[PDB]
């Protein structure tokens, strides 16, 4: 029962840390793509057109 509870807690922590890592990666990629990338675009437009 101790090992079964350990496996249950392992599965719970595994799914929790998996969703945490996934959320971190997509949120940071979203920061790159919707904040950093528009800044790249604005900087390039300012350099070229102006």
């Amino acid at each position: 029962d101790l090992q079964l509870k350990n496996l249950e807690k392992l599965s719970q922590d595994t799914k929790e840390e998996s969703r945490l890592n996934d959320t971190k990666l997509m949120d940071l990629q979203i920061k790159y793509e919707n904040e950093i990338k528009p800044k790249i675009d604005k900087t390039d437009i300012f350099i070229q057109e102006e």
């Binding site: 496996l7 392992l10 998996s18 890592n21």
Partner: protein, 50 residues
């Protein structure tokens, strides 16, 4: 003769409970192996995400 029959039946019970305990010990070793394999697999997945 009744006590000998009781001894035989209680030895049968001993054998049944010994089979149960052998199954429990096999399941405990299997639980240790499954814990190791599962937590290392989850570690691999989480570390790849990291």
């Amino acid at each position: 003769i009744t006590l000998e029959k009781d001894i035989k039946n209680l030895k049968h019970d001993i054998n049944e409970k010994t089979q149960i305990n052998e199954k429990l010990e096999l399941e405990l070793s299997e639980a240790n192996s499954k814990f190791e394999l599962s937590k290392q697999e989850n570690e691999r997945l989480l570390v790849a995400q990291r």
